[PDB]
């Protein structure tokens, strides 16, 4: 539980270095997408991935270079489609699906504050755990930037905003940063060897549950 918090996920002890790579032979939109993750994630290095070094051979490099997490974005066609967060030692790994990206905010260099919604389910709070870990644990209050991760279904929406406080019990906020929708898949448990959940269409049949 508390032992888990540290052993599988990154805590407020180090700066977490995130090895941002891309699926082989990707085009403009993937790097355009990498430029949006270059801002939001704490200490990203972009690695141009040049054919070979299967997966374990990568892990050997990021042990030596001493990274914490791997993130890989993929493209079937000209649109971005899938996002894969892996933790480098042990390997709790989360796969995701993007069906929304639309682009007037233009943010500062100040580091954004986190907020999460509706993770009653234990599988939900293990994903909430990932985004608590992978995003910065700095929040500088001033600069007034908020990153959300709302999950009212099995769909998770992340957005950025600017909050203005008036003393009459109300707060205003403007749209900023990338529009986004994610879907959880897999939880491969080993680096890529094992599964814990792996979405099927055998769900959607229930119309409920919500993991």
């Amino acid at each position: 539980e508390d032992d888990l918090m540290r052993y599988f996920n990154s805590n407020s002890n180090e700066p977490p270095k995130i090895f941002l790579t891309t699926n082989v032979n990707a085009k403009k939109s993937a790097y355009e997408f990498a430029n949006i993750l270059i801002e939001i994630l704490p200490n990203v290095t972009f690695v141009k991935r040049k054919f070979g070094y299967k997966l374990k051979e990568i892990s050997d490099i990021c042990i030596k270079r001493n990274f914490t997490d791997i993130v890989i974005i993929n493209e079937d066609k000209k649109k971005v489609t899938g996002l894969t967060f892996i933790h480098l030692p042990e390997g709790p790994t989360f796969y995701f699906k993007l069906s929304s990206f639309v682009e007037h905010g233009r943010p500062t260099s100040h580091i954004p504050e986190l907020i999460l919604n509706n993770f009653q389910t234990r599988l939900g709070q293990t994903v909430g755990r990932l985004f608590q870990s992978i995003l910065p644990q700095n929040p500088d209050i001033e600069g007034r930037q908020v990153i959300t991760l709302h999950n009212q279904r099995d769909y998770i929406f992340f957005r950025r905003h600017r909050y203005v406080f008036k003393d009459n019990e109300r707060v205003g906020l403007q749209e900023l940063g990338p529009q986004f929708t994610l879907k959880l898949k897999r939880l491969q448990r080993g680096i890529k060897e094992e599964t814990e959940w792996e979405h099927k269409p055998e769900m959607d049949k229930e119309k409920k549950k919500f993991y």
Binding site: K54, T148, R153, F157, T181
Partner: protein, 173 residues
């Protein structure tokens, strides 16, 4: 005979032809050398017919003798073709002694391509690919469209943040 077999399948049906838009004709009778079909390049019209095939990794060269026109059960006599390329082309040559120069270099040619089909192993040793083709069934395409549009409506993200900023900064005053 065989001229009568040819004319009756040239027109009047060879019921395994593919008419390509190029006007080309392809016999899919598994035992032909050229995938295309023409006179004595398709294995029914011709009576003497050689071919290279593969059943496993073992590349055999099948051979059809006019002796066996009576019995279709044992038509194609077959011989294994070692595995090294140089001795195999030499192995080929001896079988094709005193035949048409058609089957001479064309079985040599079948063997060539089918050996460089064993570039499959090259693709399958250095596989380790993190992609794999996924179908997009149009039912799922709407279970994951019309439920996201129903999610956002019931989500009320603004009100959720408006709550959990006031509820935060009252307790963190």
């Amino acid at each position: 005979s065989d001229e009568i077999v040819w004319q009756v399948i040239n027109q009047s049906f060879c019921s395994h032809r593919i008419k390509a838009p190029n006007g080309q004709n392809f016999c899919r009778n598994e035992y032909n050398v050229t995938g295309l079909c023409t006179r004595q390049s398709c294995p029914l019209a011709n009576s003497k017919y050689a071919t290279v095939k593969c059943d496993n990794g073992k590349l055999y060269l099948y051979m059809k003798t006019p002796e066996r026109a009576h019995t279709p059960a044992k038509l194609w006599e077959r011989i294994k073709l070692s595995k090294n390329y140089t001795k195999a082309l030499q192995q080929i040559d001896e079988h094709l002694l005193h035949w048409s120069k058609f089957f001479r270099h064309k079985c040599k040619q079948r063997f060539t391509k089918l050996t460089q089909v064993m570039i499959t192993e090259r693709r399958l040793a250095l596989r380790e690919e993190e992609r794999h083709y996924v179908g997009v069934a149009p039912k799922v395409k709407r279970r994951e469209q019309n439920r996201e549009r129903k999610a956002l409506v019931a989500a009320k993200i603004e009100k959720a943040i408006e709550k959990e900023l006031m509820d935060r900064l009252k307790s963190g005053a």
